[PDB]
Amino acid sequence: GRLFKITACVPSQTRIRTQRELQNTYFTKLVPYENWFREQQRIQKMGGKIVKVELATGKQGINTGLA
Amino acid sequence: MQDAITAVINSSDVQGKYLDTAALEKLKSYFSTGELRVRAATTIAANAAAIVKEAVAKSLLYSDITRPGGNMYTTRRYAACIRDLDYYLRYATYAMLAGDPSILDERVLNGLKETYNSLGVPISATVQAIQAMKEVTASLVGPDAGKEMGVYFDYICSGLS
Amino acid sequence: MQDAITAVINSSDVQGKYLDTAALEKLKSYFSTGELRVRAATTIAANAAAIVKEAVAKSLLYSDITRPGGNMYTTRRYAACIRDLDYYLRYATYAMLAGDPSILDERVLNGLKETYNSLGVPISATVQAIQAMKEVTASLVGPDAGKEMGVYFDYICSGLS
Amino acid sequence: MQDAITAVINSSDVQGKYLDTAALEKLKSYFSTGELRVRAATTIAANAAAIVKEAVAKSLLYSDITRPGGNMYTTRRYAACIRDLDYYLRYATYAMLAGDPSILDERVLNGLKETYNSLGVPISATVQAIQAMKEVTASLVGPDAGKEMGVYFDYICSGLS
Amino acid sequence: SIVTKSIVNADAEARYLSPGELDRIKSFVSSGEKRLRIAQILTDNRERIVKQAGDQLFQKRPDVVSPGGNAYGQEMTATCLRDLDYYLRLITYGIVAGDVTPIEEIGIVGVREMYKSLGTPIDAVAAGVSAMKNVASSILSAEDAAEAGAYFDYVAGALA
Amino acid sequence: SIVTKSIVNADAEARYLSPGELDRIKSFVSSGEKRLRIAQILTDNRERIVKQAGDQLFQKRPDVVSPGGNAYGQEMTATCLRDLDYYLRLITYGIVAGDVTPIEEIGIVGVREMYKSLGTPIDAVAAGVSAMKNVASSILSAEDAAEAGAYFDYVAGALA
Amino acid sequence: SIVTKSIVNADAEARYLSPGELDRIKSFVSSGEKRLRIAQILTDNRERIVKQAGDQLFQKRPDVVSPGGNAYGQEMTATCLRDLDYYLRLITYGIVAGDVTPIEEIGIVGVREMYKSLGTPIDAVAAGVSAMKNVASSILSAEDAAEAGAYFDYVAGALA
Numbered sequence A: 001g002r003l004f005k006i007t008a009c010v011p012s013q014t015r016i017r018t019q020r021e022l023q024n025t026y027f028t029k030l031v032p033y034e035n036w037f038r039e040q041q042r043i044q045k046m047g048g049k050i051v052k053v054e055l056a057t058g059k060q061g062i063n064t065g066l067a
Numbered sequence B, C, D: 001m002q003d004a005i006t007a008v009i010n011s012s013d014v015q016g017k018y019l020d021t022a023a024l025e026k027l028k029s030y031f032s033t034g035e036l037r038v039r040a041a042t043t044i045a046a047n048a049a050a051i052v053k054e055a056v057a058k059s060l061l062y063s064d065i066t067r068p069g070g071n072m073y074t075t076r077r078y079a080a081c082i083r084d085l086d087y088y089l090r091y092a093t094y095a096m097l098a099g100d101p102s103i104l105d106e107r108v109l110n111g112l113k114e115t116y117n118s119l120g121v122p123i124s125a126t127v128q129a130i131q132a133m134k135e136v137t138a139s140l141v142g143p144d145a146g147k148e149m150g151v152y153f154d155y156i157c158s159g160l161s
Numbered sequence E, F, G: 001s002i003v004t005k006s007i008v009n010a011d012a013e014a015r016y017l018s019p020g021e022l023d024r025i026k027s028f029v030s031s032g033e034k035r036l037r038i039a040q041i042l043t044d045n046r047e048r049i050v051k052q053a054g055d056q057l058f059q060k061r062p063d064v065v066s067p068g069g070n071a072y073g074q075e076m077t078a079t080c081l082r083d084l085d086y087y088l089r090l091i092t093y094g095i096v097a098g099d100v101t102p103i104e105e106i107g108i109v110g111v112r113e114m115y116k117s118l119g120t121p122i123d124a125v126a127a128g129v130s131a132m133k134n135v136a137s138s139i140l141s142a143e144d145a146a147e148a149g150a151y152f153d154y155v156a157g158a159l160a
């Protein structure tokens, strides 16, 4: 189906994490269309900043054929 | 995110200063408008669906946008669009209550223009629809509250353009 | 993803039209070849491992690619490579079955070139292997089905370039 | 990651060669520095907090960085900064123990410059701090172990700029 | 269609299509000309099916075309029929595809949110679709009407 | 601030603020001038509050200003008083906001790691903060002292 | 290598190496002599160990070099010995390293899919390695043969 290619940076606002969190801090990943609204908001509420959003699968405005 | 209170505290802190006169006035101004912001939010929540309905009717309905080939065609996309409007109205109300636009940068504009452009969501039409909501909201909350809410509706629009 | 059928439907919907002549010809055209596609997929499925084996032998073995220093050196990379070939064959078959390349863009090509470049996977040698699969596959399914599968093998190849 | 041993094995394997005289020479050099490396490590672990403390006092404290408006102002940021210093020390020790910098690329330098530039962490000030730890660590482990640890401290530094 | 579904399922299990899936695709394509025919007659009688379903709906639910009703007025009434035609067209797509997926993706997902916002009584839209099924009955053989009807029922069921 | 908290809570549930949250915001704002007054009294008497607090602390904790102690020496003693002033400043911010969020974000998160690295006995910082409360209580009415007191107590409890 | 393994574990727990882990490393680096000696001997006699191991394998497994076998033919048989040479080399890397990690990483992961594709009977590959151990066993001290044997047994056990 439709897929988003996103990049974001999510900081630590509550505790001084001592385990390697750099992997969880700056990231790039594919997020299925049906999960982007929930994921985007998740990052937003965590004080994270969204750097890049692309429609990885390309086709915009599909009426039928979303699987 | 921060409200008007915390925004001032933060600017003083970055300077390492206790609250000076200028800052104390900024704070008193917020406190004196609190009840008015609360009243407007109460009204907006009570008419949320109504605001979106009239706004859509005034700016999107009966156009290429809703006909076959439009980005608001298919019930699936029509719902996505009015859902976004519901979101804009709710966040604008929060920003209005907070007396500060940071929540919009953090929770609305944060990656929005990009998602929209990659999806092919018409930004000009979205802006027109939020503009319409600004008008509809103002006719329910009065001139003053309508102008304050307008500040936040416009903020969102500026971030999309 | 779309198949030849849902692809025509989606395009008629975008125009807001009941299926016109051109659309009907396309649907009929797909329908008249349907059994030939199934027949071909059956053969490929039954000879799946064999196709990859001969393709690898034809284009990859006994070269610098398999010797120390080549990207297919170490049992882990060899296994990974043929696993890819398995993916290509299985996906090209899906696409051939559907009569549409969308599944290839959505589930295969999407950011594949970038992953390869970062891992050091030689795109040129990969295209060769896929091209070899095309020949091996055609020798089992016959010229017509070989040509139709060739379309999807070629598509995957163009997406890596 | 890889250590000095595996590093040699891999350099010979890519050539498809059994370990030769030179390779074997490199292996001996590592094995012979083993106890010195373990000693230096044991010391460094004990002085972990003291190394960072002194490096911070030498390069960051009492400047603009720690005062209001600085990137080390607010207890939250000060703590995050020293924590990073902790990481660098620990990781450099790992690299020294292993006699190979691969763990640094894989676990430290991987996406770091981007995170810092994004959050606004002053790269230069960080480099100064890492280098202060180099001077501090050297005076504790001796010139030899200090030279070794140093190549790793500099490795992290070079990857930041 | 069944081709996509089978492929989606096969991909879910990282496998080639099963003999059954392939056999189902064989039936799907061979029965293609029949489904095309059924959809075509509906297409050919679209104007009459929509108009008559309208009258039937309005005689049954006059409230929608009375003052304050959602379809009240000439323009609103035409828009209501415009919607029935939208659904008829979607139904012909579903018949050709062999399943309701085209209808679902184009006119079912989000439908309750759209009409609720518009103030349109969804149950009446449903009743209007059922009215179209009835009108189509008067022009389809019992075999065709039964095959086509499953789609009409799907739509009316989803628009409740 | 209660305004920010109510919004965050409301957003977590994708809803508008409840009547209760809106009411709490109303009390908060009307109570604004009062909180600003208390915060002003502290700001105005900041030098004496910090200076006399240090005097009490060093009396009860002579070890911190004795050789080997963290604040030994006049420069070091000055930096100790500077930290107490930081906390007093943060406390006035808290009072204005109606809660401790300004204080924890600026001076509580990571405070233990900071002082442990510096070699500063955090329990002594807590004592110094408690001393500032004692001093402030000599210029605040019983009601005002009770209000501001909870902020000093929060900081002392968090530092201790 | 035990050094890498220890670093990976310590890193997983965000801590420096434990005194126990550092001690095991001390021991490891000093007790290396005997292992390098073993590796050298195998290296020097490589041509013979593999050649004779092949002979044994074909005597016990004639099927692999008979019409239809995977190594049927002069060239194919040469390739078979090439693989045994690969494994002998890998075995020497493992011996100097002190563990089978290099062996596992270069020649075991995915080995079944590779040989399964080629049509090579993997159990027969296991046999050739056992054969190399055997031939090597007539060149190494009973003790060196005992120590290196653990590595050979690993490859053989894994090649199935």
Ligand SMILES: *[C@H](C)[C@H]1/C(=C/c2[nH]c(/C=C3N=C(/C=C4\NC(=O)C(CC)=C4C)C(C)=C\3CCC(=O)O)c(CCC(=O)O)c2C)NC(=O)C1C
Pocket (backbone or CB within 6 Å): C060, C065, C070, C071, C072, C076, C077, C078, C080, C081, C082, C084, C085, C087, C088, C107, C108, C112, C115, C119, C121, C122, C125, C126, C129
């Ligand atoms: C084979 C013709 C050659 C080759 C290939 C090779 N590929 C990889 C690793 C990866 N291959 C993929 C590809 C896919 N994953 C998928 O899910 C799909 C389809 C939807 C595809 C096409 C990916 C993602 C990887 C990345 C890591 C992984 O194993 O999943 C390797 C291993 C690279 C490495 O060193 O780790 C290899 C060797 N190499 C060749 O020389 C050729 C010619």
Ligand SMILES: *[C@H](C)[C@H]1/C(=C/c2[nH]c(/C=C3N=C(/C=C4\NC(=O)C(CC)=C4C)C(C)=C\3CCC(=O)O)c(CCC(=O)O)c2C)NC(=O)C1C
Pocket (backbone or CB within 6 Å): B060, B061, B062, B063, B066, B067, B072, B073, B074, B075, B078, E064, E065, E069, E070, E071, E072, E076, E077, E079, E080, E081, E083, E084, E086, E087, E106, E107, E118, E120, E121, E124, E125, E128
């Ligand atoms: C008819 C049975 C009834 C009726 C209908 C009615 N609908 C509308 C307005 C709109 N209908 C749609 C419908 C769709 N958009 C889509 O993308 C699809 C899927 C293919 C559908 C079904 C839309 C977008 C509108 C809004 C107008 C526009 O075209 O942009 C109205 C008018 C409402 C108004 O007040 O303007 C009406 C009257 N009314 C009834 O009572 C019934 C039962």
Ligand SMILES: *[C@H](C)[C@H]1/C(=C/c2[nH]c(/C=C3N=C(/C=C4\NC(=O)C(CC)=C4C)C(C)=C\3CCC(=O)O)c(CCC(=O)O)c2C)NC(=O)[C@@H]1C
Pocket (backbone or CB within 6 Å): A033, A034, A036, A037, A040, A041, A060, A061, A062, B060, B065, B070, B071, B072, B077, B078, B080, B081, B082, B084, B085, B087, B088, B107, B108, B112, B115, B119, B121, B122, B125, B126, B129
């Ligand atoms: C409405 C005025 C018009 C319009 C909108 C439209 N939007 C989408 C899809 C998305 N909208 C969002 C929106 C947001 N994400 C956020 O975090 C926020 C703030 C809280 C907002 C407002 C997102 C993430 C998406 C994509 C993912 C999802 O839908 O869950 C669509 C659908 C796109 C599609 O092709 O399916 C539409 C149609 N379209 C118009 O024509 C408008 C004028």
Ligand SMILES: *[C@H](C)[C@H]1/C(=C/c2[nH]c(/C=C3N=C(/C=C4\NC(=O)C(CC)=C4C)C(C)=C\3CCC(=O)O)c(CCC(=O)O)c2C)NC(=O)[C@@H]1C
Pocket (backbone or CB within 6 Å): A010, A011, A012, A017, A019, A020, A021, A022, A023, A025, D060, D065, D070, D071, D072, D077, D078, D080, D081, D082, D084, D085, D087, D107, D108, D112, D115, D119, D121, D122, D125, D126, D129
């Ligand atoms: C200290 C010398 C200076 C400084 C540092 C500083 N860093 C951060 C925040 C982060 N630092 C890292 C770094 C790492 N995390 C890892 O896992 C690794 C590798 C093992 C490294 C090197 C990360 C990921 C962050 C972000 C997430 C987090 O904080 O947990 C900050 C705070 C940033 C903020 O504004 O919140 C600071 C202050 N600042 C200076 O001025 C220095 C010279």
Ligand SMILES: *[C@H](C)[C@H]1/C(=C/c2[nH]c(/C=C3N=C(/C=C4\NC(=O)C(CC)=C4C)C(C)=C\3CCC(=O)O)c(CCC(=O)O)c2C)NC(=O)[C@@H]1C
Pocket (backbone or CB within 6 Å): D060, D061, D062, D063, D066, D067, D072, D073, D074, D075, D078, F064, F065, F069, F070, F071, F072, F076, F077, F079, F080, F081, F083, F084, F086, F087, F106, F107, F118, F120, F121, F124, F125, F128
């Ligand atoms: C006084 C009660 C006692 C004490 C204090 C003391 N502190 C320092 C040094 C520092 N304190 C800070 C404090 C903060 N940074 C922040 O961002 C905040 C939040 C608002 C606080 C409270 C910092 C950054 C330092 C480092 C120096 C600098 O300003 O750059 C010292 C000096 C220690 C030294 O070795 O130099 C002292 C003496 N010490 C005591 O013994 C007390 C009980």
Ligand SMILES: *[C@H](C)[C@H]1/C(=C/c2[nH]c(/C=C3N=C(/C=C4\NC(=O)C(CC)=C4C)C(C)=C\3CCC(=O)O)c(CCC(=O)O)c2C)NC(=O)[C@@H]1C
Pocket (backbone or CB within 6 Å): C060, C061, C062, C063, C066, C067, C072, C073, C074, C075, C078, G064, G065, G069, G070, G071, G072, G076, G077, G079, G080, G081, G083, G084, G086, G087, G106, G107, G118, G120, G121, G124, G125, G128
């Ligand atoms: C010998 C015991 C038996 C045997 C072996 C045999 N192997 C091949 C072909 C190949 N073997 C490899 C092996 C490796 N590649 C690696 O990267 C590693 C790890 C270090 C190994 C062990 C490869 C890649 C091939 C393909 C040829 C090439 O070099 O590119 C053959 C030839 C098979 C053929 O039909 O071409 C043979 C005969 N055959 C037996 O029956 C044995 C028991």
Ligand SMILES: O[B-](O)(O)O
Pocket (backbone or CB within 6 Å): E018, E019, E020, E021
């Ligand atoms: O899909 B069946 O279940 O294999 O027919």
Ligand SMILES: O[B-](O)(O)O
Pocket (backbone or CB within 6 Å): F018, F019, F020, F021
């Ligand atoms: O938020 B309350 O619970 O409604 O006050």
